[PDB]
Design a protein around this ligand. Sequence first.
Ligand SMILES: Nc1ncnc2c1ncn2[C@@H]1O[C@H](CSCC[C@H](N)C(=O)O)[C@@H](O)[C@H]1O
Length: 191
Amino acid sequence: ISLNQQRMNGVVAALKQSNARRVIDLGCGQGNLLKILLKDSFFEQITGVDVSYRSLEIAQERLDRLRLPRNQWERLQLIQGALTYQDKRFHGYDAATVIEVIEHLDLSRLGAFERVLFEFAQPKIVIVTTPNIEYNVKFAHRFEWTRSQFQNWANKITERFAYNVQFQPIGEADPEVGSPTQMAVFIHRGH
Ligand SMILES: Nc1ncnc2c1ncn2[C@@H]1O[C@H](CSCC[C@H](N)C(=O)O)[C@@H](O)[C@H]1O
């Protein structure tokens, strides 16, 4: 029950409760979450997106360490691309996951990513997790966000975009500085 494993379980759990079968992982990195989704037949489509070629090659590498039925491999798709660009391949998914990605975006990229995600793609579900820098300080990697910053960011999202947000920490209550990992589950409003 490591921290990362806690994050993944938390994300998979949120996807399932929303019955999000078709998922796109933005900033997929080495494919940690992609490996878990591909192995799980609950998911009907797994797509991972990253701007790094090195990371995508590695993702494909470990994803290949899996043994799966033939029809199961056709669910996977790897795409190189920046998250700040409106890619038509980002449409039609039940959910988009942005895991430990926001902290590594500067101002001239965060705003663009927000539109790409909450306006352009506009999936029904969006799961975002980021490190709680208030936990990393009390229990020692410092450009992370505070619980306040993260929650204001997310609330500001529901003010500009057609979404409502629910917070669900995945780590373990301090219970003074909250859990080590903050998660936000955005659900699109009905029309
Ligand atoms: N503008 C951008 N467009 C696409 N990917 C980006 C990006 N900026 C950063 N990334 C990617 O976002 C990832 C941040 S670390 C990702 C870890 C991964 N989510 C996990 O399974 O833990 C890296 O792969 C980085 O290359």
